[PDB]
Design a protein around this ligand. Structure first.
Ligand SMILES: NS(=O)(=O)c1ccc(C(=O)Cn2cnc3ccccc32)cc1Cl
Ligand SMILES: NS(=O)(=O)c1ccc(C(=O)Cn2cnc3ccccc32)cc1Cl
Ligand SMILES: [Zn+2]
Ligand SMILES: [Zn+2]
Lengths: 261, 261
């Protein structure tokens, strides 16, 4: 029952999940020495991201994050296969230290991080099959800073008190997922890595957008206080806080940038 | 046996050394939100650091770092118990990413880091015995950055070519080890933590000096390029680079500082 704190926390995940001790792990610190501009990193296009407000999508507390399931007609155009959406979720810190992004930039954490997970739908039938397989996943990561209130993220956060405990599910009306992405999505970091959670398979094509988005302190506080890793009837409740992995050694990788400066 | 890369790297240390997945792990990021001035933190005194130039001290390559053996009449005064020296060694990065300290400051790595390991000789007979015991160890950590040539560090670095491979040893004539300390040693960070290498026991009283020292670009390159992890006859040599642990989570804790300004 892996966690982010205590005996089953991240320095122990390799005991049960060997790839968490293997190569090509994520997240990483994005810093100058390992950045290289690559002019072939052309813009992604986000197709079928504007989900209908009259449809509804399943939000679930899985005991580790809060996730929204996404429809497979939603895809990224621009990679060398079509990657179709499967879910998005978040990582965050806690009310007294709102600095829980997974990737860091020049050694600094952002307040939180959004991951929109896609799998190679040209090659694989679903994300679970793709996950332990080559070229299987592609994640878009958005760095989140404390700033202005964000009505688009609130389309997710306004439901947190209904998915407070592990296993709980709620429905979120459709909205335009692209509203969760930052300015100038053409500027991104790209690298080969891994799932940042067990089983940590090294099967992810990472795209981290260069620019962060902002959500407010009160939105972060709701995210950091609403949720539990445990079931509603658990007599040992555990708050869902600080659910980010530490950054990983590079293992000789570079990170390629679509921006030269 | 443990390494900083491949499947025996830091994420897997806790399989054979369970304290590497336990409490109070080091190193950590030293940042402003978690610092607190403590007037109780008076200056340490370094006694017996002026090593007889008529004695010789064993330099080894142990496959993890370069280590100089120190005599037990060398000690720190100022802690409640006397802590006697046992050895010093270093941690560093690589020429493509020359930022291999263990501790970080405000998210930033220094180029390298020196540890002068001591043990509580008032309570215990030797460092190995002290290492898994209460109040067992005390380490002085000096952060290193690139700048001026440093003749005192060259009293060690000039012997590196003699300890290129694992198991090799050189004798270093006594010199004043206090020459390796930075300016204004009254200015430091103090916290309770652990060894940064296996077995990672949570038994170290850390003192990280506020101010770094300088070594030249050529000294830093020599430290990064002179050594191998492997024995001389190993048909698959491994360079000794990147021999630092990633920073650990440190939550709901303070680092105390002897300085406020
Ligand atoms: N945080 S992260 O974005 O790196 C991430 C987090 C979870 C998953 C999953 O694919 C979760 N998951 C979904 N189906 C799975 C089957 C086996 C193992 C894990 C599985 C993928 C990713 Cl890419
Ligand atoms: N990097 S570090 O300064 O945290 C450190 C690195 C190594 C050691 C040792 O004492 C290594 N060591 C050497 N012999 C040992 C016997 C038992 C346990 C540890 C032993 C101690 C320390 Cl404190
Ligand atoms: Zn994630
Ligand atoms: Zn050390």
């Amino acid at each position: 029952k892996w966690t982010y704190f205590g005996p089953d926390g991240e320095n122990s995940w390799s005991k049960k999940y060997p790839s968490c001790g293997g190569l090509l792990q994520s997240p990483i610190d994005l810093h100058s020495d390992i950045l290289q501009y690559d002019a072939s990193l052309t813009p992604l296009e986000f197709q079928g991201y504007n989900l209908s407000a009259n449809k509804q999508f399943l939000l679930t507390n899985n005991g580790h994050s809060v996730k929204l399931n996404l429809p497979s007609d939603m895809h990224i155009q621009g990679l060398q296969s079509r990657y179709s959406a499967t879910q998005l979720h978040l990582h965050w810190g806690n009310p007294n230290d709102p600095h829980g992004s997974e990737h860091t930039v020049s050694g600094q954490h952002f307040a939180a991080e959004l991951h929109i997970v896609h799998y190679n739908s040209d090659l694989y039938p679903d994300a679970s099959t793709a996950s332990n397989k080559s070229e299987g996943l592609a994640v878009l990561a958005v760095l989140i800073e404390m700033g202005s209130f964000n009505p688009s993220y609130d389309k997710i956060f306004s439901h947190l008190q209904h998915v407070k405990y592990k296993g709980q599910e709620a429905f979120v009306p459709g909205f335009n997922i692209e509203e969760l992405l930052p300015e100038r999505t053409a500027e991104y970091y790209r690298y080969r890595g891994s799932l940042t959670t067990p089983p940590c398979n090294p099967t992810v094509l990472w795209t981290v957008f260069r620019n962060p988005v902002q959500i407010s302190q009160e939105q972060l506080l709701a995210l950091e206080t609403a949720l539990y890793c445990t079931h509603m009837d658990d007599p040992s409740p555990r708050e869902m806080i600080n659910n980010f992995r530490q950054v990983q050694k590079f293992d000789e990788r570079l990170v390629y940038t679509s921006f030269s400066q």
